[PDB]
Design a protein around this ligand. Sequence first.
Ligand SMILES: Nc1nc2c(ncn2[C@@H]2O[C@H](COP(=O)(O)OP(=O)(O)O)[C@@H](O)[C@H]2O)c(=O)[nH]1
Ligand code: BEF
Ligand SMILES: [Mg+2]
Lengths: 171, 382
Amino acid sequence: EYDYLFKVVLIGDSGVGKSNLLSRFTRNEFNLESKSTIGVEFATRSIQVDGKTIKAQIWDTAGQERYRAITSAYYRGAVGALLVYDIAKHLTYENVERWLKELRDHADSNIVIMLVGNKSDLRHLRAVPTDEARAFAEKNGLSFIETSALDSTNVEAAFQTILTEIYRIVS
Amino acid sequence: LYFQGAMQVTVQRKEKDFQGMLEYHKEDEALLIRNLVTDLKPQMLSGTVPCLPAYILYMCIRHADYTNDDLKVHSLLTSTINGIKKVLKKHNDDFEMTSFWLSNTCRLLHCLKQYSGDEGFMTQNTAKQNEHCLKNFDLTEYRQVLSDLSIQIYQQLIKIAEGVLQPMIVSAMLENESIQGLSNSYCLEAIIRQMNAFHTVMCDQGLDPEIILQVFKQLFYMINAVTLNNLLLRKDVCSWSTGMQLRYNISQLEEWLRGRNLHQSGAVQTMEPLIQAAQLLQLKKKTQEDAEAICSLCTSLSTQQIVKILNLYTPLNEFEERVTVAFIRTIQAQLQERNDPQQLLLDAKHMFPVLFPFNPSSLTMDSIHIPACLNLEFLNEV
Ligand SMILES: Nc1nc2c(ncn2[C@@H]2O[C@H](COP(=O)(O)OP(=O)(O)O)[C@@H](O)[C@H]2O)c(=O)[nH]1
Ligand code: BEF
Ligand SMILES: [Mg+2]
């Protein structure tokens, strides 16, 4: 059982690694041949914070328009969001603005939002400099981290950080 | 000149260590079948190695083989098989008892193979084990009878488990909103608790893990069909909201599987129709592109099923619309190359054929001893 249940949505373009951030976080698995998410999918994991049990209920969503749910109204009740782009594809980062605008059209105003630059293992292919994405996060009131679902770098830290920040706001 | 036999000369028996055999007197056989099969309750055997009843039976058979007593062999087995059947007709609704005798029947079968004498069943024996093999008798025909029995028993185990789960499925899977932002009753936790109980029973009794994996593959198949079939009848649950709820429910079942190391059972795969139905409910349903996305994605739903769900689809906010006739016809035209079944509903009672593994063990017959609680003191070690 648990003391808090935190609904957290994963949003951002198709291919950026949302489902693998989720599989890495919830069962330490990564798959190179990930199937595209259809509609909304789910996984959960419980962690400790301030000595209390926090169940993270993670809503993993489709980034491909032809795979998306008819409506974004399901964002309601979300206390956290990860807005994910691929550091090796500047377009996925350009699209963060639009993901972000939609989120704030449907989400509660206290939602905690973390901008996540995924695939940091692809250093040789980087298209989004860290400083650029960080200034965007700052200016938009987003927290910010770079992760790699592949080599696991900062995945634990991204989720632990957002869940801890949510705990501080709601407790 | 004569000799009556006289110190009256008598045939004395050689004094040797435990061979791991078990002899009994023909007159005492009903007491044996009675205390070892008929009146034996699974729970008396807590705190011993699983399937001790099967080992004990093979040890008795072994001795019978050794005295060359084929009347004993036939008697014992024929009588044991009938005992077990009788216990199962009486306990036809008892999951624990049924699984108990499945497990033991299978181990007795493994013993008869492992110690058959056929070198093909023996590749994994230690020398000590090889010398516990049957010497005189080839019991192939009985092995066949035991294999037939275990299938009958497995079917009764599935029947029992499905009977318990049935009244729970629709309510848990379709009639219980348990996550936020989407807007006799059972919840999904109660199905999961019931499956834990089944799993624990099967584990505690040392059922072959391949059989356990198959049991849950089979029960998940049932949840798939029962849930999908109810959804194929009802407008009130065909909305995007149910789609998401259902997907969440399915993911909890999947995580349960992983937690019990059951994820490779094939169970997940049997849910693909229900998963696709859940996705279908969530997807856009207006344009040509939308219809192509649906036809590409719904490979485990028949055309009739996809059409039924689109026909049933009922928005929950007036701000959304019912699927149009033209949209359905577009689906129908796109799905023409298909060869789907004539019947709309899935057969919820479909049984996957069970494959029973052969799992020889490292137990040595000459280290096995009967616990007093079985009241088999009238058995004697040889
Ligand atoms: N190199 C690298 N590849 C990744 C990483 N995360 C995901 N991928 C790959 O990116 C592809 C799309 O990943 P997926 O998680 O399905 O993307 P999603 O549509 O955002 O859910 C898959 O081939 C992956 O295995 C990462 O951190 N580094
Ligand atoms: F799951 Be992804 F967004 F294709
Ligand atoms: Mg995904």
